[PDB]
Amino acid sequence: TCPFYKKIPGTGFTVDAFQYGVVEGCTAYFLTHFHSDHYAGLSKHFTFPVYCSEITGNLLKNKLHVQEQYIHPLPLDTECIVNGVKVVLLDANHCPGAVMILFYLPNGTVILHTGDFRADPSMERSLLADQKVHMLYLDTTYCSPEYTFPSQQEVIRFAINTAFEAVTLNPHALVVCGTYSIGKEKVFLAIADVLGSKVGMSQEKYKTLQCLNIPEINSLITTDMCSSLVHLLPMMQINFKGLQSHLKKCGGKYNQILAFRPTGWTHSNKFTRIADVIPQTKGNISIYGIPYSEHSSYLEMKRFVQWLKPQKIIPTVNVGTWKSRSTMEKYFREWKLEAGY
Ligand code: NI
């Protein structure tokens, strides 16, 4: 059954709750972003109102075939009325089209639902600055102090420098980047830009990218593999067997592959810096795991929450075990005692 952490009290709303069938008493289903664990259950046969960003709405229509009459896109940073309740959508700094949602309850309570987010100080100057938030439904993916990671900017600088050096030393080297969802587009776009190439990909992934309102996108991507020296493949194909295979397919146009695997966190984050990363190398193939995250680090999370000073926190991630739940509740209390709310 639908868990309590997906229901917004005092409303007939649910958030990211599409795999339970009809939810008794739901008059509007919000969708924070187009990642499969969040939209799981949506299809062309859905007949209830879905509220979301413009970009998520483009993906629901073109990739899922949800019918236009059930998709209600809203602009960001704008007070809107939905079924009699004032809401605002804010940029979540996650993947394209990902939002946080502010609900203004008839009783005066204000609730923020982060969806999936990477907290940033710029959020402290959004419409969140303007009033008190009583309850926070929080993306707690990396809620433990071991989780450190570098800025997105640092990671992109590393990738750009690594690729440019390799291809300038060997003009017959191929760059490959893995993907399995939207998100992390900066990795493959930044590498292609330094190499004076478009990025080449499959027809299904090009279609996906043409939904995302990225400026000048026609100048940046293509379905013609042969013309391009940065290719995208399914993350499942980013390994030696999969890459050797792929290298054959270009027909001796390339003699070396340099591949990136954008992970979230991995335990080499605890012992190594970005300046000191190394790849796995079998022959003329090298695979780099780069810690490009679209979720808050523990310190970014903690800063956000200490700034917001909510009355109550409801975790939406790692909630399945008593041990995780208890650990999270301990950090929340530390934070509140340190900051004095
Ligand atoms: Ni996500």
DSSP state of 23: P
| Chain centre to alpha carbon of residue 33 | 8
What is the Å distance from ligand 1's center to 155 Cα? 19
- 17: exposed, middle or buried (Cβ count in 10 Å: 0-12, 13-18, 19+): buried
What is the Å distance from ligand 1's center to 34 Cα? 7
**Tokens in use for 127?**
């419409």
Q: Read out DSSP for 209-278?
A: HHTS--TTHHHHEES-STT-SEEEEEGGG-SHHHHHHHHHHT-SS-SEEEEEEEES--GGGGT--STT--
What is the Å distance from ligand 1's center to 52 Cα? 14
| Calculated CA dihedral for residues 51, 52, 56, 57, nearest 10 degrees | 40
What is the Å distance from ligand 1's center to 196 Cα? 30
From residue 163, alpha-carbon distances to 228, 268, 288 in Å are 14, 21, 11
Please state, in angstroms and rounded to a whole number, the distance separating the CA atoms of residues 305 and 309. Answer: 6
What is the Å distance from ligand 1's center to 32 Cα? 9
What is the Å distance from ligand 1's center to 281 Cα? 30
What is the Å distance from ligand 1's center to 2 Cα? 19
Residue where the block lists tokens 């990025």: 199
Please state, in angstroms and rounded to a whole number, the distance separating the CA atoms of residues 327 and 321. Answer: 10
Give φ, ψ of 211 to 5 degrees: -80, -10
What is the Å distance from ligand 1's center to 287 Cα? 24
What is the Å distance from ligand 1's center to 143 Cα? 15
| Cβ 260 vs Cβ 82: under 8 Å | no
**Tokens in use for 287?**
């695979």
- 125: exposed, middle or buried (Cβ count in 10 Å: 0-12, 13-18, 19+): exposed
What is the Å distance from ligand 1's center to 97 Cα? 11
Please name the residue ranges forming H helices in 171-212: 185-194, 203-210
Please provide the size of the chain in residues: 341
Q: What residue ranges define each of the domains in the chain, with the CATH number in brackets? A: 1-147+296-341 (3.60.15.10), 148-295 (3.40.50.12650)
Way it was determined: X-ray
- 245: exposed, middle or buried (Cβ count in 10 Å: 0-12, 13-18, 19+): exposed
Please state, in angstroms and rounded to a whole number, the distance separating the CA atoms of residues 244 and 291. Answer: 24
What is the Å distance from ligand 1's center to 172 Cα? 36
Please state, in angstroms and rounded to a whole number, the distance separating the CA atoms of residues 22 and 19. Answer: 9
Pairing between β-strand 230-234 and β-strand 199-200 as defined by DSSP bridges: parallel
| Cβ 4 vs Cβ 24: under 8 Å | no
What is the Å distance from ligand 1's center to 331 Cα? 23
What is the Å distance from ligand 1's center to 183 Cα? 8
What is the Å distance from ligand 1's center to 33 Cα? 7
What is the Å distance from ligand 1's center to 35 Cα? 5
Please state, in angstroms and rounded to a whole number, the distance separating the CA atoms of residues 79 and 68. Answer: 23
What is the Å distance from ligand 1's center to 38 Cα? 7
**Tokens in use for 263?**
């992970």
What is the Å distance from ligand 1's center to 146 Cα? 21
Nearest Cα residue to 11 out of 135, 140, 139, 138: 135
What is the Å distance from ligand 1's center to 140 Cα? 12
Three-state DSSP class for 180? coil
Using a CB cutoff of 5 Å, list residues around ligand 1, an ion: 35, 116
Count of CB atoms situated within 10 Å of the CB of 149: 24
What is the Å distance from ligand 1's center to 163 Cα? 27
Please calculate the CA angle 61-13-142 and round it to the nearest 5 degrees. Answer: 80
What is the Å distance from ligand 1's center to 116 Cα? 5
What is the Å distance from ligand 1's center to 277 Cα? 26
**Tokens in use for 206?**
């090009």
| Cβ 312 vs Cβ 319: under 8 Å | no
Resolution of this entry, Å: 1.5
Give φ, ψ of 133 to 5 degrees: -110, 125
Please state, in angstroms and rounded to a whole number, the distance separating the CA atoms of residues 56 and 32. Answer: 8
Pairing between β-strand 13-15 and β-strand 71-73 as defined by DSSP bridges: unpaired
| Cβ 130 vs Cβ 312: under 8 Å | no
Strands (E), the chain: 7-8, 13-15, 28-30, 50-52, 71-73, 80-82, 85-91, 99-104, 110-113, 135-138, 173-179, 199-200, 221-222, 230-234, 256-263, 280-282, 285-291, 312-315
| Cβ 95 vs Cβ 74: under 8 Å | no
What is the Å distance from ligand 1's center to 182 Cα? 9
Please state, in angstroms and rounded to a whole number, the distance separating the CA atoms of residues 85 and 267. Answer: 44
